[PDB]
């Protein structure tokens, strides 16, 4: 009852040039059927980039927009994003339950999915987010959230998040490669890993993706 | 310090280009600063920012609630300033490195970062509020000079002003629709942000005029 992510690998396509983003995504298409598109690409090339990716590749689209506004604005952001063809959207939990519920309501109405970001993968996440993360996760469970994002860079924290959300929830995890998270270790807890720079900055992105997949072969 | 006409910033969150341009045009004599967010940008494209500057000459604050890792924050700020935004709103909750990433790009491109410390909606009480004073102190430590705090809790807005000092610039949303009072908010904030009370009004011009009339002794 979850999205079927090919090879447990999601491409974080954060190149800001349309031609480059299209080239690299095309090059790794045989390995990946799920692409995470964020604001670096969307603010550079427009929401029609989601359309273009759909048309060009057979890929699901997760809009990594880290939605973090008041409920009224969150609703509008989700509506615009799903209208453009995103399958799912990533939403911050730290602004509270009403802000998350606004996103869930739009997703329910529009037949799409919310991913709740609990803890983040970068060093600064330790300052405020980490201390709230278990409660944000528990809040997500109470709100009926089924999809979550947690940090590969902190295996102990990722393990705890998996415990809180349960085995049935879907968990994806960034911070793999460039930020130091290990693909295999991360897949102990996450359903899929998110990988950006390790793939898209490689001299041969296809070889990079193939290499990650070979390293996790027995987990597929 | 940014000089906001009438201490009033229009939150232009209409999602149609024609309506957004028409309504902004109707209130142009009252404002010179417009806050543009994702509702309009995701619906009409980042080119709308240059169009606002071409039509109105207004300052543009990009309310993008920037809340990613430092590397991604850098890219978001670069794309946003390339589109002609004068300033960007950044969440403090993701920590100091994420804020510093934004400050670096703003310095490079001659723009400003506004640090959002406490939000105006009820859910802000769950996690943000208890971190807000510390987020503000982090802003001070980082050399942030521009801040955003909640009209809906004037005691919290006053505390934010206390932390950042009189020299810092403070703008405040939640006025009107969310219940904040224009005059009370301006006791502590340099400028108020107003969206729906203006842009959903039967007569936006009269709405803006009315707000300004209510604070005329503060201008
Ligand atoms: O806690 C998080 C949440 N999201 N991302 C996003 O995941 C991707 C990671 O890419 P990378 O492999 O190049 O580090 C980027 O798009 C980044 O904004 C994180 O890195 N950490
Ligand atoms: O703590 C915050 C931060 N930002 N905003 C933004 O300020 C505007 C408020 O508009 P309104 O007057 O229509 O409520 C909207 O764009 C909203 O996303 C808030 O309302 N509260
Ligand atoms: Cl709201
Ligand atoms: Cl930090
Ligand atoms: Cl980073
Ligand atoms: Cl709430
Ligand atoms: Mg310079
Ligand atoms: Mg008055």
Tab-separated table of C-alpha atoms and ligand atoms in Angstrom:
chain	number	residue	atom	x	y	z
A	1	UNK	CA	0.000	0.000	0.000
A	2	UNK	CA	3.009	2.252	-0.575
A	3	UNK	CA	4.653	3.698	-3.685
A	4	UNK	CA	6.870	1.095	-5.364
A	5	UNK	CA	10.258	2.820	-5.599
A	6	UNK	CA	12.519	1.080	-8.098
A	7	UNK	CA	15.804	-0.061	-6.544
A	8	UNK	CA	14.891	1.703	-3.292
A	9	UNK	CA	16.624	4.758	-4.767
A	10	UNK	CA	15.171	8.257	-5.228
A	11	UNK	CA	17.087	10.844	-7.264
A	12	UNK	CA	17.279	14.295	-5.667
A	13	UNK	CA	17.390	16.389	-8.832
A	14	UNK	CA	18.764	19.709	-7.565
A	15	UNK	CA	20.562	20.868	-10.705
A	16	UNK	CA	19.252	24.331	-11.585
A	17	UNK	CA	19.667	24.190	-15.335
A	18	UNK	CA	16.855	22.534	-17.315
A	19	UNK	CA	19.161	21.004	-19.946
A	20	UNK	CA	21.494	19.517	-17.326
A	21	UNK	CA	18.654	18.288	-15.092
A	22	UNK	CA	16.968	16.596	-18.047
A	23	UNK	CA	20.223	15.042	-19.290
A	24	UNK	CA	21.215	13.586	-15.939
A	25	UNK	CA	17.742	12.310	-15.105
A	26	UNK	CA	17.525	10.647	-18.532
A	27	UNK	CA	20.901	9.007	-17.984
A	28	UNK	CA	19.817	7.316	-14.771
A	29	UNK	CA	16.255	6.519	-15.871
A	30	UNK	CA	16.899	2.771	-16.165
A	31	UNK	CA	17.772	2.682	-12.455
A	32	UNK	CA	15.255	5.067	-10.905
A	33	UNK	CA	11.492	5.568	-11.341
A	34	UNK	CA	11.079	8.131	-8.587
A	35	UNK	CA	12.502	11.646	-8.730
A	36	UNK	CA	12.478	14.257	-5.978
A	37	UNK	CA	12.227	17.782	-7.435
A	38	UNK	CA	12.830	20.729	-5.135
A	39	UNK	CA	12.910	24.495	-5.191
A	40	UNK	CA	16.402	24.812	-6.709
A	41	UNK	CA	15.044	23.415	-9.975
A	42	UNK	CA	11.455	24.709	-9.697
A	43	UNK	CA	12.446	28.300	-8.905
A	44	UNK	CA	14.949	28.227	-11.752
A	45	UNK	CA	12.767	26.617	-14.434
A	46	UNK	CA	9.111	26.808	-13.379
A	47	UNK	CA	6.494	24.330	-12.167
A	48	UNK	CA	6.155	23.094	-15.757
A	49	UNK	CA	9.418	21.211	-15.147
A	50	UNK	CA	7.271	18.641	-13.315
A	51	UNK	CA	5.211	18.245	-16.504
A	52	UNK	CA	8.342	17.930	-18.577
A	53	UNK	CA	9.810	15.207	-16.357
A	54	UNK	CA	6.538	13.263	-16.529
A	55	UNK	CA	6.482	13.561	-20.309
A	56	UNK	CA	10.159	12.647	-20.762
A	57	UNK	CA	10.596	9.923	-18.133
A	58	UNK	CA	8.376	7.278	-16.600
A	59	UNK	CA	8.918	8.752	-13.131
A	60	UNK	CA	6.853	9.565	-10.056
A	61	UNK	CA	7.475	13.034	-8.726
A	62	UNK	CA	7.963	14.015	-5.100
A	63	UNK	CA	7.941	17.793	-4.647
A	64	UNK	CA	10.416	18.583	-1.888
A	65	UNK	CA	8.953	21.935	-0.931
A	66	UNK	CA	9.388	21.590	2.852
A	67	UNK	CA	6.032	23.264	3.283
A	68	UNK	CA	6.279	25.402	6.410
A	69	UNK	CA	3.656	28.136	6.443
A	70	UNK	CA	0.341	28.866	8.176
A	71	UNK	CA	-2.533	26.503	7.333
A	72	UNK	CA	-4.164	28.855	4.779
A	73	UNK	CA	-0.951	29.304	2.814
A	74	UNK	CA	-0.017	25.633	3.135
A	75	UNK	CA	-3.305	24.724	1.467
A	76	UNK	CA	-2.572	26.972	-1.501
A	77	UNK	CA	0.967	25.656	-1.895
A	78	UNK	CA	-0.246	22.062	-1.914
A	79	UNK	CA	-3.042	22.848	-4.383
A	80	UNK	CA	-0.649	24.527	-6.826
A	81	UNK	CA	1.854	21.702	-6.470
A	82	UNK	CA	-0.601	18.877	-7.064
A	83	UNK	CA	-2.221	20.813	-9.929
A	84	UNK	CA	1.191	20.783	-11.597
A	85	UNK	CA	1.333	16.994	-11.423
A	86	UNK	CA	3.363	16.171	-8.319
A	87	UNK	CA	2.481	12.784	-6.854
A	88	UNK	CA	3.506	13.813	-3.350
A	89	UNK	CA	4.762	16.780	-1.368
A	90	UNK	CA	7.190	17.050	1.566
A	91	UNK	CA	5.906	19.091	4.516
A	92	UNK	CA	7.647	20.284	7.700
A	93	UNK	CA	6.152	19.161	10.991
A	94	UNK	CA	7.703	21.820	13.225
A	95	UNK	CA	5.073	24.482	12.430
A	96	UNK	CA	2.517	22.281	14.222
A	97	UNK	CA	-0.499	20.071	13.698
A	98	UNK	CA	-2.810	22.577	12.022
A	99	UNK	CA	-0.222	23.322	9.361
A	100	UNK	CA	0.241	19.593	8.699
A	101	UNK	CA	-3.503	18.917	8.694
A	102	UNK	CA	-3.969	21.647	6.059
A	103	UNK	CA	-1.652	19.709	3.744
A	104	UNK	CA	-3.256	16.338	4.510
A	105	UNK	CA	-6.683	17.784	3.747
A	106	UNK	CA	-5.616	19.016	0.319
A	107	UNK	CA	-3.822	15.751	-0.418
A	108	UNK	CA	-6.956	13.775	0.491
A	109	UNK	CA	-9.145	16.003	-1.666
A	110	UNK	CA	-6.776	15.891	-4.632
A	111	UNK	CA	-5.853	12.206	-4.431
A	112	UNK	CA	-2.160	12.695	-3.641
A	113	UNK	CA	0.257	12.115	-0.746
A	114	UNK	CA	1.988	14.029	2.052
A	115	UNK	CA	5.438	13.107	3.342
A	116	UNK	CA	6.118	14.469	6.820
A	117	UNK	CA	9.678	15.627	7.457
A	118	UNK	CA	10.510	14.942	11.104
A	119	UNK	CA	14.247	15.375	11.698
A	120	UNK	CA	16.684	16.841	9.191
A	121	UNK	CA	20.078	15.545	8.134
A	122	UNK	CA	22.311	18.620	8.447
A	123	UNK	CA	24.305	19.707	11.529
A	124	UNK	CA	21.983	22.627	12.339
A	125	UNK	CA	19.107	20.206	12.844
A	126	UNK	CA	20.582	19.463	16.271
A	127	UNK	CA	19.794	22.973	17.546
A	128	UNK	CA	15.976	22.869	17.547
A	129	UNK	CA	14.581	20.171	15.261
A	130	UNK	CA	16.132	17.135	16.949
A	131	UNK	CA	14.560	17.885	20.333
A	132	UNK	CA	11.098	18.115	18.756
A	133	UNK	CA	11.461	15.261	16.290
A	134	UNK	CA	10.053	12.345	18.285
A	135	UNK	CA	7.002	14.447	19.127
A	136	UNK	CA	6.640	15.600	15.518
A	137	UNK	CA	6.725	11.940	14.468
A	138	UNK	CA	4.143	10.964	17.092
A	139	UNK	CA	1.988	13.879	15.932
A	140	UNK	CA	2.240	12.572	12.383
A	141	UNK	CA	1.057	9.143	13.503
A	142	UNK	CA	-1.862	10.693	15.379
A	143	UNK	CA	-2.797	12.751	12.292
A	144	UNK	CA	-2.755	9.598	10.157
A	145	UNK	CA	0.381	10.460	8.182
A	146	UNK	CA	1.648	7.387	6.330
A	147	UNK	CA	4.801	8.763	4.675
A	148	UNK	CA	7.837	10.219	6.439
A	149	UNK	CA	11.296	11.656	5.849
A	150	UNK	CA	14.163	11.166	8.333
A	151	UNK	CA	17.943	11.574	8.361
A	152	UNK	CA	20.453	9.014	7.108
A	153	UNK	CA	23.252	10.931	8.826
A	154	UNK	CA	21.963	9.862	12.252
A	155	UNK	CA	21.265	6.102	12.211
A	156	UNK	CA	20.211	6.114	15.880
A	157	UNK	CA	17.645	8.835	15.186
A	158	UNK	CA	16.437	7.172	11.976
A	159	UNK	CA	15.979	3.894	13.871
A	160	UNK	CA	13.896	5.662	16.523
A	161	UNK	CA	11.746	7.387	13.897
A	162	UNK	CA	11.061	3.996	12.302
A	163	UNK	CA	9.987	2.662	15.707
A	164	UNK	CA	7.593	5.551	16.265
A	165	UNK	CA	5.928	5.354	12.848
A	166	UNK	CA	5.775	1.566	12.743
A	167	UNK	CA	6.693	-0.949	10.084
A	168	UNK	CA	3.653	-0.157	7.905
A	169	UNK	CA	4.570	3.497	7.385
A	170	UNK	CA	6.747	4.502	4.438
A	171	UNK	CA	10.065	6.188	5.244
A	172	UNK	CA	12.517	7.829	2.848
A	173	UNK	CA	15.897	9.206	3.883
A	174	UNK	CA	18.287	11.852	2.482
A	175	UNK	CA	21.853	12.610	3.529
A	176	UNK	CA	23.302	9.594	1.686
A	177	UNK	CA	26.609	10.048	-0.119
A	178	UNK	CA	27.524	13.732	-0.036
A	179	UNK	CA	26.441	14.246	3.587
A	180	UNK	CA	28.000	10.966	4.723
A	181	UNK	CA	25.101	8.555	5.166
A	182	UNK	CA	25.708	4.947	4.073
A	183	UNK	CA	23.182	3.432	1.611
A	184	UNK	CA	23.049	-0.059	3.140
A	185	UNK	CA	22.952	1.112	6.764
A	186	UNK	CA	20.191	3.588	5.923
A	187	UNK	CA	18.048	0.903	4.268
A	188	UNK	CA	18.011	-1.004	7.565
A	189	UNK	CA	15.329	1.519	8.552
A	190	UNK	CA	14.270	3.512	5.484
A	191	UNK	CA	12.220	2.046	2.623
A	192	UNK	CA	14.206	4.139	0.145
A	193	UNK	CA	17.248	6.373	0.128
A	194	UNK	CA	17.354	9.824	-1.420
A	195	UNK	CA	20.581	10.595	-3.299
A	196	UNK	CA	21.461	13.861	-5.035
A	197	UNK	CA	25.029	15.105	-5.513
A	198	UNK	CA	26.719	11.675	-5.446
A	199	UNK	CA	24.773	10.943	-8.611
A	200	UNK	CA	24.157	14.271	-10.322
A	201	UNK	CA	27.680	15.691	-9.894
A	202	UNK	CA	29.391	12.455	-10.972
A	203	UNK	CA	31.314	12.335	-14.249
A	204	UNK	CA	29.011	9.409	-15.082
A	205	UNK	CA	25.733	9.644	-13.158
A	206	UNK	CA	24.537	6.295	-14.521
A	207	UNK	CA	27.683	4.583	-13.263
A	208	UNK	CA	27.271	6.311	-9.895
A	209	UNK	CA	23.661	5.132	-9.543
A	210	UNK	CA	24.559	1.636	-10.721
A	211	UNK	CA	27.348	1.562	-8.149
A	212	UNK	CA	25.044	2.531	-5.302
A	213	UNK	CA	22.578	-0.142	-6.382
A	214	UNK	CA	25.296	-2.807	-6.565
A	215	UNK	CA	26.311	-1.927	-2.997
A	216	UNK	CA	22.746	-2.657	-1.796
A	217	UNK	CA	21.950	-5.547	-4.161
A	218	UNK	CA	21.019	-8.065	-1.446
A	219	UNK	CA	18.492	-5.582	-0.003
A	220	UNK	CA	16.462	-5.385	-3.218
B	1	UNK	CA	16.776	50.325	7.426
B	2	UNK	CA	14.099	49.564	4.837
B	3	UNK	CA	11.632	52.444	4.445
B	4	UNK	CA	8.167	50.922	4.076
B	5	UNK	CA	5.533	53.404	2.889
B	6	UNK	CA	2.738	53.712	5.466
B	7	UNK	CA	4.370	50.916	7.536
B	8	UNK	CA	2.193	48.585	5.456
B	9	UNK	CA	3.366	45.576	3.439
B	10	UNK	CA	0.875	43.902	1.097
B	11	UNK	CA	0.877	40.097	1.247
B	12	UNK	CA	-0.060	39.304	-2.340
B	13	UNK	CA	-1.228	35.679	-2.096
B	14	UNK	CA	-3.787	35.721	-4.909
B	15	UNK	CA	-2.950	32.880	-7.283
B	16	UNK	CA	-3.980	34.422	-10.589
B	17	UNK	CA	-1.705	36.880	-12.399
B	18	UNK	CA	-4.551	39.102	-13.644
B	19	UNK	CA	-6.147	39.436	-10.205
B	20	UNK	CA	-2.804	39.866	-8.425
B	21	UNK	CA	-1.736	42.669	-10.771
B	22	UNK	CA	-5.144	44.368	-10.703
B	23	UNK	CA	-5.499	44.345	-6.922
B	24	UNK	CA	-1.896	45.470	-6.352
B	25	UNK	CA	-2.520	48.250	-8.859
B	26	UNK	CA	-5.627	49.308	-6.945
B	27	UNK	CA	-3.648	49.779	-3.732
B	28	UNK	CA	-0.376	51.023	-5.233
B	29	UNK	CA	-0.792	54.564	-3.923
B	30	UNK	CA	-0.757	53.181	-0.379
B	31	UNK	CA	2.255	50.867	-0.528
B	32	UNK	CA	5.742	50.512	-1.947
B	33	UNK	CA	6.547	47.087	-0.556
B	34	UNK	CA	4.957	43.815	-1.599
B	35	UNK	CA	5.447	40.384	-0.048
B	36	UNK	CA	5.215	37.670	-2.695
B	37	UNK	CA	5.020	34.047	-1.626
B	38	UNK	CA	4.680	30.580	-3.061
B	39	UNK	CA	0.936	30.771	-3.726
B	40	UNK	CA	1.554	33.352	-6.463
B	41	UNK	CA	5.008	32.174	-7.557
B	42	UNK	CA	4.060	28.494	-7.940
B	43	UNK	CA	0.920	29.472	-9.862
B	44	UNK	CA	2.388	32.083	-12.211
B	45	UNK	CA	6.161	31.638	-12.209
B	46	UNK	CA	9.118	33.553	-10.804
B	47	UNK	CA	8.883	36.024	-13.711
B	48	UNK	CA	6.025	37.676	-11.782
B	49	UNK	CA	8.587	39.348	-9.520
B	50	UNK	CA	10.160	41.320	-12.359
B	51	UNK	CA	6.680	42.160	-13.628
B	52	UNK	CA	5.775	43.686	-10.257
B	53	UNK	CA	8.931	45.802	-10.330
B	54	UNK	CA	8.253	46.875	-13.915
B	55	UNK	CA	4.668	47.879	-13.146
B	56	UNK	CA	4.948	49.295	-9.627
B	57	UNK	CA	8.639	49.796	-8.822
B	58	UNK	CA	7.836	48.296	-5.423
B	59	UNK	CA	10.286	46.454	-3.178
B	60	UNK	CA	9.719	42.713	-3.220
B	61	UNK	CA	10.085	40.475	-0.180
B	62	UNK	CA	10.070	36.793	-1.151
B	63	UNK	CA	8.251	34.945	1.624
B	64	UNK	CA	9.639	31.524	0.885
B	65	UNK	CA	9.965	30.277	4.495
B	66	UNK	CA	13.389	28.890	3.555
B	67	UNK	CA	13.837	25.728	5.606
B	68	UNK	CA	16.268	23.324	3.963
B	69	UNK	CA	19.874	22.186	4.497
B	70	UNK	CA	22.581	24.828	3.914
B	71	UNK	CA	23.519	23.627	0.385
B	72	UNK	CA	19.900	23.742	-0.792
B	73	UNK	CA	19.194	27.000	1.028
B	74	UNK	CA	22.038	28.592	-0.916
B	75	UNK	CA	20.502	27.524	-4.231
B	76	UNK	CA	17.005	28.684	-3.246
B	77	UNK	CA	18.340	32.123	-2.303
B	78	UNK	CA	20.353	32.401	-5.494
B	79	UNK	CA	17.339	31.547	-7.678
B	80	UNK	CA	15.148	33.940	-5.695
B	81	UNK	CA	17.495	36.920	-5.920
B	82	UNK	CA	18.126	36.188	-9.612
B	83	UNK	CA	14.387	36.727	-10.080
B	84	UNK	CA	14.716	40.214	-8.584
B	85	UNK	CA	13.577	39.776	-4.977
B	86	UNK	CA	15.049	42.385	-2.632
B	87	UNK	CA	14.780	40.171	0.446
B	88	UNK	CA	13.889	36.651	1.491
B	89	UNK	CA	12.178	35.199	4.556
B	90	UNK	CA	14.050	32.326	6.209
B	91	UNK	CA	13.006	29.993	9.039
B	92	UNK	CA	15.314	29.917	12.012
B	93	UNK	CA	14.117	26.524	13.319
B	94	UNK	CA	16.474	24.473	11.060
B	95	UNK	CA	19.468	26.061	12.814
B	96	UNK	CA	22.390	28.446	12.388
B	97	UNK	CA	24.158	26.853	9.423
B	98	UNK	CA	20.980	26.980	7.371
B	99	UNK	CA	20.524	30.674	8.176
B	100	UNK	CA	24.184	31.467	7.443
B	101	UNK	CA	23.861	29.882	3.994
B	102	UNK	CA	21.153	32.463	3.212
B	103	UNK	CA	23.080	35.368	4.723
B	104	UNK	CA	26.049	34.521	2.497
B	105	UNK	CA	24.032	34.679	-0.732
B	106	UNK	CA	22.212	37.830	0.356
B	107	UNK	CA	25.550	39.557	1.015
B	108	UNK	CA	26.870	38.445	-2.388
B	109	UNK	CA	23.862	39.784	-4.274
B	110	UNK	CA	23.160	42.908	-2.206
B	111	UNK	CA	19.962	41.689	-0.558
B	112	UNK	CA	18.542	41.089	2.908
B	113	UNK	CA	17.533	38.067	4.960
B	114	UNK	CA	14.493	38.303	7.239
B	115	UNK	CA	14.632	35.745	10.071
B	116	UNK	CA	11.269	34.257	11.020
B	117	UNK	CA	11.352	33.505	14.751
B	118	UNK	CA	7.781	32.784	15.874
B	119	UNK	CA	4.824	32.249	13.590
B	120	UNK	CA	1.340	33.691	13.913
B	121	UNK	CA	-0.932	30.658	13.629
B	122	UNK	CA	-2.152	28.450	16.513
B	123	UNK	CA	0.169	25.556	15.631
B	124	UNK	CA	3.158	27.813	16.302
B	125	UNK	CA	2.542	27.110	19.988
B	126	UNK	CA	3.489	23.429	19.663
B	127	UNK	CA	7.183	23.652	18.783
B	128	UNK	CA	8.138	27.071	17.425
B	129	UNK	CA	7.145	29.237	20.376
B	130	UNK	CA	9.341	27.446	22.904
B	131	UNK	CA	12.345	27.857	20.587
B	132	UNK	CA	11.589	31.404	19.465
B	133	UNK	CA	13.583	33.465	21.973
B	134	UNK	CA	16.611	31.264	21.336
B	135	UNK	CA	16.109	31.579	17.572
B	136	UNK	CA	16.055	35.349	18.003
B	137	UNK	CA	19.265	35.294	20.069
B	138	UNK	CA	20.786	33.152	17.291
B	139	UNK	CA	19.780	35.865	14.850
B	140	UNK	CA	21.586	38.425	16.970
B	141	UNK	CA	24.678	36.222	17.209
B	142	UNK	CA	24.656	35.784	13.410
B	143	UNK	CA	24.324	39.505	12.751
B	144	UNK	CA	20.778	39.285	11.406
B	145	UNK	CA	19.150	42.725	11.289
B	146	UNK	CA	15.699	41.862	9.916
B	147	UNK	CA	13.082	39.758	11.694
B	148	UNK	CA	9.520	38.482	11.418
B	149	UNK	CA	7.247	37.848	14.407
B	150	UNK	CA	3.568	37.359	15.203
B	151	UNK	CA	0.888	40.073	15.278
B	152	UNK	CA	-1.407	37.574	16.966
B	153	UNK	CA	0.659	37.546	20.174
B	154	UNK	CA	1.735	41.104	21.007
B	155	UNK	CA	3.459	39.986	24.221
B	156	UNK	CA	5.576	37.592	22.155
B	157	UNK	CA	6.132	40.286	19.557
B	158	UNK	CA	7.264	42.663	22.295
B	159	UNK	CA	9.671	40.043	23.656
B	160	UNK	CA	11.104	39.617	20.146
B	161	UNK	CA	11.637	43.380	19.917
B	162	UNK	CA	13.358	43.283	23.327
B	163	UNK	CA	15.788	40.618	22.193
B	164	UNK	CA	16.706	42.148	18.842
B	165	UNK	CA	16.849	45.774	20.001
B	166	UNK	CA	15.485	49.005	18.545
B	167	UNK	CA	18.002	49.098	15.667
B	168	UNK	CA	16.793	45.845	14.117
B	169	UNK	CA	13.929	45.847	11.607
B	170	UNK	CA	10.804	43.863	12.517
B	171	UNK	CA	7.803	43.071	10.290
B	172	UNK	CA	4.690	41.277	11.459
B	173	UNK	CA	1.944	39.183	9.789
B	174	UNK	CA	-1.323	37.900	11.230
B	175	UNK	CA	-3.017	41.314	11.022
B	176	UNK	CA	-6.689	41.369	10.142
B	177	UNK	CA	-7.756	37.895	9.086
B	178	UNK	CA	-5.801	36.085	11.820
B	179	UNK	CA	-6.913	38.619	14.421
B	180	UNK	CA	-3.950	40.915	14.948
B	181	UNK	CA	-4.609	44.627	15.393
B	182	UNK	CA	-2.744	47.081	13.123
B	183	UNK	CA	-2.074	49.791	15.727
B	184	UNK	CA	-1.169	47.420	18.551
B	185	UNK	CA	1.232	45.520	16.318
B	186	UNK	CA	3.002	48.755	15.364
B	187	UNK	CA	3.869	49.359	19.008
B	188	UNK	CA	6.597	46.758	18.443
B	189	UNK	CA	6.913	46.072	14.698
B	190	UNK	CA	8.278	48.570	12.187
B	191	UNK	CA	5.757	47.427	9.590
B	192	UNK	CA	2.652	45.266	9.408
B	193	UNK	CA	2.014	42.613	6.776
B	194	UNK	CA	-1.583	42.426	5.545
B	195	UNK	CA	-2.966	39.958	3.000
B	196	UNK	CA	-6.608	38.881	2.992
B	197	UNK	CA	-8.038	41.950	4.771
B	198	UNK	CA	-6.951	43.848	1.672
B	199	UNK	CA	-6.891	41.387	-1.230
B	200	UNK	CA	-10.187	39.620	-0.422
B	201	UNK	CA	-12.034	42.850	0.443
B	202	UNK	CA	-14.921	43.980	-1.776
B	203	UNK	CA	-12.917	47.165	-2.238
B	204	UNK	CA	-9.183	46.594	-1.625
B	205	UNK	CA	-8.318	50.291	-1.988
B	206	UNK	CA	-10.812	51.299	0.697
B	207	UNK	CA	-9.573	48.433	2.865
B	208	UNK	CA	-5.976	49.653	2.657
B	209	UNK	CA	-7.090	53.254	3.144
B	210	UNK	CA	-9.060	52.199	6.211
B	211	UNK	CA	-6.137	50.408	7.816
B	212	UNK	CA	-3.912	53.420	7.225
B	213	UNK	CA	-6.554	55.757	8.691
B	214	UNK	CA	-6.594	53.594	11.839
B	215	UNK	CA	-2.844	54.041	12.300
B	216	UNK	CA	-2.449	57.585	10.951
B	217	UNK	CA	-1.045	58.824	14.272
B	218	UNK	CA	1.730	56.214	13.997
B	219	UNK	CA	2.976	57.363	10.593
C	1	LIG	O1	16.758	16.468	6.168
C	1	LIG	C1	16.861	16.656	4.826
C	1	LIG	C2	15.731	16.913	4.053
C	1	LIG	N1	15.865	17.099	2.749
C	1	LIG	N2	17.083	17.047	2.180
C	1	LIG	C3	17.139	17.213	0.725
C	1	LIG	O2	17.588	15.974	0.187
C	1	LIG	C4	18.549	16.214	-0.869
C	1	LIG	C5	19.896	15.670	-0.470
C	1	LIG	O3	20.762	15.732	-1.596
C	1	LIG	P1	22.292	15.313	-1.521
C	1	LIG	O4	22.379	13.820	-1.754
C	1	LIG	O5	22.883	16.053	-2.702
C	1	LIG	O6	22.830	15.621	-0.160
C	1	LIG	C6	18.521	17.713	-1.142
C	1	LIG	O7	17.508	18.003	-2.113
C	1	LIG	C7	18.093	18.290	0.205
C	1	LIG	O8	17.455	19.546	0.099
C	1	LIG	C8	18.160	16.795	2.917
C	1	LIG	O9	19.384	16.703	2.378
C	1	LIG	N3	18.093	16.597	4.249
C	2	LIG	O1	4.021	33.640	11.042
C	2	LIG	C1	3.587	33.952	9.795
C	2	LIG	C2	4.511	34.031	8.747
C	2	LIG	N1	4.075	34.341	7.536
C	2	LIG	N2	2.774	34.561	7.306
C	2	LIG	C3	2.396	34.936	5.936
C	2	LIG	O2	1.929	36.278	5.971
C	2	LIG	C4	0.716	36.403	5.191
C	2	LIG	C5	-0.457	36.736	6.071
C	2	LIG	O3	-1.558	37.059	5.237
C	2	LIG	P1	-3.015	37.324	5.802
C	2	LIG	O4	-3.108	38.785	6.201
C	2	LIG	O5	-3.913	37.076	4.611
C	2	LIG	O6	-3.285	36.484	7.000
C	2	LIG	C6	0.576	35.108	4.412
C	2	LIG	O7	1.296	35.236	3.185
C	2	LIG	C7	1.286	34.094	5.303
C	2	LIG	O8	1.824	33.009	4.579
C	2	LIG	C8	1.899	34.497	8.315
C	2	LIG	O9	0.602	34.733	8.147
C	2	LIG	N3	2.256	34.189	9.586
C	3	LIG	CL1	-4.412	29.934	8.477
C	4	LIG	CL1	24.567	25.065	13.056
C	5	LIG	CL1	24.517	21.368	3.208
C	6	LIG	CL1	-2.251	22.884	16.111
C	7	LIG	MG1	30.046	41.904	-3.057
C	8	LIG	MG1	-5.363	53.720	15.772
